[PDB]
Amino acid sequence: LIIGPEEDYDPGNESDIIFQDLEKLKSHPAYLVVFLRYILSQADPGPLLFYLCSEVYQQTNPKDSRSLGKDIWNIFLEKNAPLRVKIPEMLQAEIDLRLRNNEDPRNVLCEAQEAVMLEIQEQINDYRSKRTLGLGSLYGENDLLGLDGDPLRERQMAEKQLAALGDILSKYEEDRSAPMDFAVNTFMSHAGI
């Protein structure tokens, strides 16, 4: 091997597993907010926000989802959308066509979510590399350094980190912060935060 000159160095697990899968990351509000904080500060927030809002639409009664579907379109898919997200031309055309004729857009919307998942997974992997760099605390990870395996306690922490996000959303212009806020609240409120 060969001994090092400063052996006094201290390098200082469940977490990793949670941060790598959006599936269980979505089920851990406190963890999701840390990732949200990362996205809003370091990357394009479009993909994640579109995905989360779409998730709500998919879980909402077709009878109460009309306006939500319209908001998703105007916010993420519209030609001049503030948080426009990149998705296959075929899918965008199909979604517009079904929304304009009042048909069921769920299946094509789901396909759009899977397309965006490519970019989201890339952002997830990027954040994991930041954690490897030992920089997780820059995005509020200390708030998770005390959580126990309990749902209520977590959604509790969720609304406290969520309130502190304003500091990052303020770095954005109204034309973008306004729709982003609407996006976050739509998911969080449906998550029970």
Binding site: I3, D8, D10, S41, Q42, L133, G134, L135, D167, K171
Partner: protein
Amino acid sequence: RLVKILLLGAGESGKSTFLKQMRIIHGQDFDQRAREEFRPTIYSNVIKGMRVLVDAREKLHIPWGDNKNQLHGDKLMAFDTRAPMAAQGMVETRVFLQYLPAIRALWEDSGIQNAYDRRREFQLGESVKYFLDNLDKLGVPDYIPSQQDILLARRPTKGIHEYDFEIKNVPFKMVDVGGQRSERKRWFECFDSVTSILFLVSSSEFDQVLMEDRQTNRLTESLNIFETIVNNRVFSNVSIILFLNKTDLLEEKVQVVSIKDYFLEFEGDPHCLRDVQKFLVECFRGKRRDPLYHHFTTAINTENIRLVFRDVKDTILHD
């Protein structure tokens, strides 16, 4: 009103050395007593450093220049680096003097020298060579570390440290933090009211791997850290200045090692300092996702830092 400057960078990039220069150039400097406090650290650097060399000589199967030096090698490996004082990175003078004869003989051995030249295969700072080449002055009974010795003395930084000074009626507060992985968890506490970030990079680390996990390329690590800092919207109002430090070491390294072997995208003369420096700057500029202030520095050279900080000051005071 206060100009707060934060020093960031990976481990061993030169942050604490830069901080010492500010004290030398704009502060009270280091008087004899303050300098004597570095003596135990210097003696520890030498003993622990030589121990690394003999261990490396053995594990890399490098032949002894003279195997009679095996006796000296044994004496050094027998030094307990885990004992109380040694653990704190300190060595008493009487103890140092007991190992001096063995260390002197080892440093003259061609096998030990060959081990040093292959240090990229393990972990060892070049300041150890600086002190081993000055064993005569370190060995004198009344040795008092010089300013240069104090700048070269090595100790990994733990925690957050501040040094305040003034330049022409303008108050400055400089913050130093540890750059090795486990210490970066403290960075988030240092950004309140930060005016500027001085990002240090060892320009000569392209052929080395991290101490933390002897696998990741050191330059790659520096690029990844810079990427997360420079693209963080929270620092949009903070001026970031890049210091490609250890220029002196890079000048000597490009003559024996090709960066091309570690970074294929390099297309120029590997033995040309300017070609490599231009490549390094391009790499960092490319990490920003839509003005890159940069300087080639040698933190241990007071005159170099005096003039570089002059430019930095003007840049900060005009942003």
